[PDB]
Symmetry: D2
Subunit: 448 residues, 4 copies
């Protein structure tokens, strides 16, 4: 026996995290075994009693792993034998580590996903609640990281909330396919003892049962799917982080993170580094790496079970802990950051209203092309005079288009600017208000 | 201006494919602009007529792209001006290339997903039909690419069909989020003219409208998703390809692909190369590469629109054409390959029944650990006598365990072996029939949706 | 029988046509080799080489007509040859396989492309170095966590990107080395069966050496993968420079303005310039990485030797070669034509950024690290309480904090003095920047030669 | 003003403590440079070096106690140093940053690791080449599309993998050289402010040269990326070799059997061995590639200079270093102890595989390529008709097809003669194989 081979093959170091679900799966299997008459009533009692002790050992942190333990399945089996004797061996009857390992992982994932959902909905709720409070705040909207047009700060917050809501929906879709029992698939051909799979389903609380035994022990669709959901969520978080890091620069000055989510030097007490957001942004790569690895692991693999499949667990574990930490830090950052209403409003410039000046002519019937040419001229005329467009005289304006009336004065108002956007989904207050309502309802349906 | 910059920035070369959907998007927008008062009834008639003429030029292949057209959106508006004059310019009022391009890509992807769905469901149907017909065929089931135990050829075919059915379910989920109208989001803050977005939705036949203008124009979730669906689908096909390429070796000898899906030489007329399956398997890399690229493009990008987002189209086009081609070739391969029932059956060996021999004792009350011990003794006994286990004598077996009775001869039958797995999902004939029924019911639902 | 979708998917002619000229060059060399092996006559050789020339010429002019039967470039070029000189043409492929012919084609193509990519990369690096030399006096904030950390020379910023790009150039040279090995003569997988003169082929095609093992030479796509790895790391460097430049071009930072040629805008906001050029560059990091990811997946788990899977290499190489070629030139245009705002870079320098220098001032007078740092922190607090900035504290103010503070301390509050502290090799001190420029010109020279 | 999730997420101590020793070496070299600069007196230096050595030993003995306040390995070492020698410890970080300290620690560790990896890699290559020498007489089928194409020597196959591995070894040397550049003395980003003697730090730490630009030296992770690229392409090679051997080990091919140490089996089927070793190896290509993917995404689009995002480099490097070390050794074991079936390999050789040589026979006689080819096809065609193998055709039968067929055609139908055709450099002919073995031995020598 080669020690390097043994260490490489062995999965106990990390798969012991599945200790509890593994016992849960065995208890369920033991009850079906009895029903199938493989075990006597008394034998069942003994088995279940022993399994409960083991759950407790792991639970209290007293379980002692042994050098011989290849995986969590062998470890639990070894300890039950130690606790109740020979009778423990009837438990693996008609059972394979192949369907046992995917049953364990799916039960762990269903529980993990339930937790991730709570944190994801909390992040969304936090953004939506903040959008509701700061709905009167206006700042520049950007394209190419250049000032485009005024937008409400809440529109920006809600843009991230909406995208995250789609991540929550995908999470639900992933959870559905994970909530399918694979136990009773045996090594690849199914269970040979006509085990009551419906009974196993009910006991382990799965929603339905796997359709084909070969597919059940061979596929890791649920792992890839979860990693795809995870990666896109991180993409969203990498973008929100990017936005917030830039807005927190001294140059932008739109906001400041709380002390808990930033770092800084006593020599420059006014400066705060957004470490929280940089950690979050870098995890998009950490999680994407996991998705890439499993995809490459599964590609070109022959049916059915192959040891290549063992690489699934460490990837799922890393991403579950990554998502759980990242979502809570994101929530914290969003709920505690402080905005500078003053600097956001200060960033609004008259130049950003030339588009609105053109729209003014459009609403009066001037064709789009000529309205844009007119505004461009007003902008040019102001520039030649060394003044801003909101300062041009009505006479100056008419020298370019008699269509400009004294009411053109209303164009140079940033509230009036964002208020143009009443069509559904836009930045006008009535629209932002509607979005908050839709999101509250969406979160409700998702939580449910 | 810099020529190389202009070439790199211009998207006309490929976004040309969006010609029809772009025209369809402008027609719906034109209709809403008229209802909004930006266009007169007559102007709307002139614009829709001109737009219809451009649609025909593209379909007929006579559209003339000018050196000045930077993108499909520009080419179409230029042409509309050539056709109807000045009024053509009012078309873009309140619209932006930002909400126009994602509307175009979504309309295009919605149509492509319908076509892909059709070929995906056809592949699944083909595998299911063959499993129904060849339901008596039995062969080795593998683990570590080593013979593990008997299974029905149909169980193998259905394992691939079940996976593909999950792919079809994901396709639907992706299609749902793609079927959301982004038009009327403007450059980023919304449409400034109170365009009737419900009307645009109904005209373009989208299921609902986008919730937030900034997100509608900035996100490419729908591209990523589609690419994740495509990639997992390809993973499944590369696995089925791996299986069939191996099963097609002369060493395995289980099956032979038709001439249409293989290649060969006259010097060796009996040898066939599965080029079709190798093309398919390598397309998993091709598709995954598009997924990785778009994810990297979006990572770390600030809000809202950035030119980085232009990389979406070539990746979507490639994957759509890869899937449509790959799915039809896969269906072809599955329906036209020829299996060797004789070699598949010859592949089944006695050695593969030692587990069964152990279950035989188990079903008689013998504890798992000791039934396996007894079956082991049996194997060794036959081993030291130069004979296969099914040739071991009744008294021989008895010397090992008295619980071995005359009825043990039924263990040495491969049909009885697979018939052990009647538990839902197993390889027993009844289970296979149930699966066929389940998938058919599943396909019915996915199709009526 | 034949399936239209299958033959369409298997056919590579639509893209492998690009290898037309190099496919013909490899045939001219193999022909010459066949003649030496005694397979062709001196008379035939002249015929064949004469026909290949016409073919080679037809592609060059753009008059070659591909036919429905042409499944790939190898088949197309042969078809036309037979059409040009007759049955004698059919002897050219004697002992040759599409297996060793296609890899020979791709490497010759990549050798030429890499030489072109080298020129562009070296020009980008030279652009950054020469600009650094000219603007060596410009000082602006150095950033960490995108927060102002400390004064640095703008040329130090330019050279940081130049140095990274230099390592990309070095990698390109290593990749080209392995690409510059002849695979022709490996046959289908067991080698050339006619005892062809591989050295003659090497010489004729101008490869540096020949492949050591037939199976490997036929199935490996290492040269494609590392070309792609090199391309991907190069794009990463460019994505970072793009990010910096995009942020520095914001009106918030106001450090620089791209030229109109490499940006977009509207007459409605004439002063605003969108950095489309840099955005295209940043996004191509994804595009190129996607190619590396695809080929690695195509090769993973493949059995020996040739398999049709390998056909996916060509489209990935073509895309990346064309992407780098366009991207590097656009990058060079961006760097050489952008305008910096010395005024704004200078205005971003604040007294608060010298608190670390203030501590260092004490460290050089023997004050321990902890005490000096504490001392500076106290000055920062005193300044704030007094309603001023640290460069405004009086000597008495400073002495009340530490006895080591002497009148010369006023020299700390000078940004040139600040960057001039970093004379240790690699720092932002003017002499260090000068040295780097000289080292980079040297490196470019040696790489240029290599 | 502190958040437990944020703290846990931000600290790197859990994993960067692996850099405990090289961190100490970096501190010792720095301390010496400081003494030379005059920042430390010789006496202070002797006390600092003495404390650093004790910390080095504590880690060596697994006695080092990490405290909850330890954010990273740099912080934990500085804390303990002060506990051991008092205030004097504070002068050590003078003019230094964790920014140039961490990359120095990572390059030192990676240089040591690449040294170990090269040894195992060179040993894997040697294993293949020496086996090829010994089994040089063995012949078996060569495959294209996994279909029998033409006879080749077993040694040609083995050497094909050795040659690819040899390029991996070359890339490793290239990567090591760029890793062997000292970044210490770069400070936070602008360089070292105390005119520290970098050439001295270089000599003490044994780097080949020193970094050229402080910002780049602190910001770049090229060294991490290209080492992950080297590792990923190396894993691709191993995945390819694993695929070949897993297939050759099938009952269906019967070409070889793995030893018990690197295989797994079933008790009811003692003659069957599962190549778990090779599957673990194949799957690791995905695991390593995942690491490559993650770091690329982490770096993509990041602004200069240091960002907390860069913290993700370490876990990826450690995982891959440990993966290659184990994988290379297992691969060596599998190749060294596996047993081939000369009988089965020769058995797989068939007359059908010689039609090609028959055509070559005519071309050497002077028959134009296409004629020789068409003639060979007629030969196989007629053999089939008469329902006999091609080696059974009478010279008469052959002459009717082509006048150029002489009695010596009998030479074509021999497998050794078949492989012997390939004497051109690189071919499978015994002489060509011998030349390869010699070339590879010299290569391995030079790569040292
Ligand atoms: N070892 C095994 N399955 C192990 C599952 C748990 C494993 N650690 C994993 O994570 O995949 N199975 C087989 C083959 C079986 O598939 O028939 C064998 O005994 O070699
Ligand atoms: N050009 C543009 N979006 C173009 C979309 C179509 C493009 N080919 C793509 O594929 O993304 N937008 C802006 C900035 C706007 O976003 O405010 C501009 O005019 O510079
Ligand atoms: N099809 C082939 N080589 C094709 C090379 C060019 C191809 N378009 C590619 O790009 O890989 N070879 C074989 C098998 C040979 O590998 O022995 C055959 O069909 O006979
Ligand atoms: N935290 C930091 N460097 C940390 C290095 C080690 C870290 N665990 C990593 O792995 O990147 N730097 C700064 C900013 C400095 O870069 O100016 C700070 O003190 O906030």
């Amino acid at each position: 026996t080669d020690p390097i081979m043994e260490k490489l093959n062995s999965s106990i170091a990390y798969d012991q995290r599945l200790s509890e679900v593994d016992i849960q799966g065995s208890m369920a299997y033991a009850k079906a075994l009895e029903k199938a008459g493989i075990l006597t009533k008394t034998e069942l009692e003994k088995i279940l009693s022993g399994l409960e002790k083991i759950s407790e050992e792991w639970s209290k942190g007293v379980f002692v792993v042994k050098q011989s333990d290849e995986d969590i399945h062998t470890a639990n089996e070894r300890r039950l034998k130690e606790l109740i004797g020979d009778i423990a061996g009837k438990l693996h009857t008609g059972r394979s580590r192949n369907d046992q390992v995917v049953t364990d992982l799916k039960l762990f994932m269903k529980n993990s996903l339930s937790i991730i959902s709570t944190h994801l909905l909390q992040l969304i709720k936090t953004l939506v609640e903040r959008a509701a409070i700061e709905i009167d705040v206006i700042l520049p909207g950007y394209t190419h990281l250049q000032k485009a047009q005024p937008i409400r700060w809440s529109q920006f917050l809600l843009s991230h909330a909406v995208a995250l809501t789609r991540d929550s929906e995908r999470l639900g879709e992933v959870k559905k396919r994970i909530n399918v029992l694979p136990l009773g698939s045996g090594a690849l051909a199914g269970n040979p003892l006509d085990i009551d799979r419906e009974m196993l389903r009910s006991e382990l609380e799965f929603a339905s049962i796997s359709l084909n035994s070969m597919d059940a022990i061979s596929e890791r669709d649920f792992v890839v799917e979860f990693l795809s959901f995870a990666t896109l969520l991180m993409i969203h978080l990498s973008k929100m982080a990017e936005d917030l890091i830039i807005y927190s620069t001294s140059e932008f000055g739109f906001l400041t993170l709380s002390d808990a989510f930033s770092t800084g030097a006593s020599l420059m007490p006014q400066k705060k580094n957004p470490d929280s957001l940089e950690l979050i942004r870098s995890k998009a790569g950490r999680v994407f790496g996991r998705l890439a690895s499993i995809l490459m692991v599964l590609k070109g693999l022959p049916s059915t079970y192959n040891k290549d499949l063992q690489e699934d667990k460490e990837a799922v574990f890393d991403v579950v802990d990554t998502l759980t930490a990242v979502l809570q830090v994101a929530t914290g950052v969003i709920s505690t950051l402080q905005i500078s209403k003053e600097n956001m409003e200060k960033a609004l410039t008259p130049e950003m209203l030339a588009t609105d000046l053109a729209l003014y002519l459009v609403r009066k019937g001037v064709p789009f092309r000529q309205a844009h040419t007119a505004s461009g001229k007003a902008v040019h005329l102001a520039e030649t005079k060394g003044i801003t467009i909101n300062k041009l005289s009505l006479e100056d304006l008419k020298s370019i288009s008699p269509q400009f009336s004294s009411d053109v004065s209303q164009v140079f108002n940033f509230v009036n600017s964002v208020e143009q956007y009443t069509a559904l989904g836009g930045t006008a207050k009535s629209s932002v208000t509607t979005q908050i309502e839709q999101l509250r309802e969406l979160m409700k349906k998702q939580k449910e």
